[PDB]
Design a protein around this ligand. Structure first.
Ligand SMILES: NC(=O)C1=CN([C@@H]2O[C@H](COP(=O)(O)OP(=O)(O)OC[C@H]3O[C@@H](n4cnc5c(N)ncnc54)[C@H](O)[C@@H]3O)[C@@H](O)[C@H]2O)C=CC1
Ligand code: NI
Length: 395
């Protein structure tokens, strides 16, 4: 079907191979190339050549312009492309959001000649481009400047509108090119945010087993084992990631990309996003509400899992579980018994170079106990968190 599929996308190729070997139906992956390595601009150029692009837009911001945009744009010009590094400017609080304002700012400075968009940056840039390109019916290329998240390959765009952050569903990148040396160069906080977002998968996978057994939610064995593999390697390499060695950031980014790839293949976020992510969503809402600057997704995710792993460990051994069926008792128990302690999570997060507790990034206890009680209400997901907050005897 595509040799570029089974050639310039060994990651996605092998993910699909796994799902197929466990006899599972999945949506075909619609990312044609995922390159992760040295250069990557070489292969980017090869791809735009192959697809006969010409008028290329590179959506960048203050920072990503500097550390990626100019390099890429100049090399594109030298090869004979109409390239341009278009900038997204900051809001009053020095933040670059996926708000309607930034969306429309991108969606006018891109002119009708333009036949391809390129997200040069991180999750937010990637959302604005993911959305904008979809509404202007153009392919967009993933150029990540940090291994901070698993939502580069995603179809959905968490954009802000009216007065809330909501996830419109759109279309995935046409390709992805990750410069391993640009990633190594990234702030340790961002690398550690990637590690954070991956540590969320300690509790997300379990909440997915709860979801599976209890609420009869879509579940994939092969998927669960894929994200297990990924999570396992990230941990193993916790030191390599800390120091930001080649192996370490390679393993981080490959694991995050595999997370987004399963999410894509299965058409929902359940294996990657559990109670820790829901809490994280609630905190984020509170930070917008307080009118104060946003903090890294992944940082919040690590800080959330560090607590919610203990919450679930306690639930699993609560006498309240005797009100419940033998089936639901043994489901919660068996799903959560293998959870490590909050302290171990925090220890990994520390070693990695990221924050363990929300006071470190300045959330505070107020919004923690607030989020912990209401987060379950954010999305129709049977989590440990819902089992708690919808049961007197566990409240
Ligand atoms: N499934 C999905 O669609 C997912 C969505 N997200 C999105 O991700 C956002 C947060 O992701 P973040 O990684 O925090 O992105 P971000 O762009 O919001 O924050 C990264 C910050 O670091 C800067 N930066 C990026 N690369 C850099 C580099 N190489 N060197 C120096 N500075 C650099 C950026 O300019 C920005 O100020 C959320 O707001 C959400 O919209 C997050 C995960 C998954
Ligand atoms: Ni996440």
């Amino acid at each position: 079907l595509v040799p570029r599929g089974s050639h310039m996308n060994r990651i996605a190729a092998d993910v699909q191979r796994a799902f197929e070997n466990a006899g599972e139906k999945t949506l075909p992956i619609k990312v044609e190339e995922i390159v992760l390595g040295k250069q990557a601009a070489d292969s980017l150029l090869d791809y735009v050549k192959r697809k006969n692009n010409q008028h290329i837009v590179l959506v960048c911001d203050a920072n990503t312009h500097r550390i990626a945009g100019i390099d890429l744009e100049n090399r594109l010009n030298q090869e004979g492309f109409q390239a341009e590094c278009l900038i997204i400017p900051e809001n009053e609080a020095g933040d670059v959001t996926a708000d309607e304002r930034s969306l429309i700012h991108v969606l006018i400075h891109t002119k009708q000649p333009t036949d391809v968009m390129i997200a040069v940056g991180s999750g937010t840039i990637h959302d604005i481009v993911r959305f904008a390109a979809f509404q202007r019916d153009l392919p967009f290329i993933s150029y990540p400047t940090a291994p901070s998240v698993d939502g580069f390959t995603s179809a959905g765009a968490p954009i802000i509108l009216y007065g809330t952050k909501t996830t419109i569903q759109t279309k995935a990148p046409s390709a992805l090119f990750a410069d391993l040396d640009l990633l190594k160069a990234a702030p340790q906080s961002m690398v550690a945010a990637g590690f954070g977002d991956m540590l969320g998968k300690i509790t997300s996978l379990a909440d997915w087993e709860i979801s599976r057994h209890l609420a009869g939610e879509p579940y994939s064995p092969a998927g669960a084992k894929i994200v297990q593999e990924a999570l396992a390697a990230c941990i193993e390499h916790t030191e390599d990631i800390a120091m930001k060695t080649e192996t370490g950031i390679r393993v981080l980014m490959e694991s995050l990309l595999v997370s987004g790839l399963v999410m894509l293949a299965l058409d929902h976020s359940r294996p990657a996003s559990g109670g820790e992510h829901h809490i994280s969503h609630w905190i984020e809402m509170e930070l917008m509400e307080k009118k104060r600057p946003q903090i890294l997704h992944g940082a919040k995710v690590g800080c959330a899992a560090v607590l919610l792993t203990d919450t679930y460990r306690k639930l699993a051994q609560d006498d309240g579980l005797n009100e419940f069926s033998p089936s639901r008792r043994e489901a919660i128990q068996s799903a959560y018994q293998t959870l490590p302690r909050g302290e171990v999570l925090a220890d990994w997060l520390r070693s990695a170079g990221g924050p363990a507790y929300f006071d470190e990034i300045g959330v505070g206890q107020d919004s923690v106990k607030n989020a912990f009680r209401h987060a379950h209400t954010l999305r129709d997901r049977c989590t440990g968190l819902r089992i708690i907050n919808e049961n007197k005897t566990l409240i």
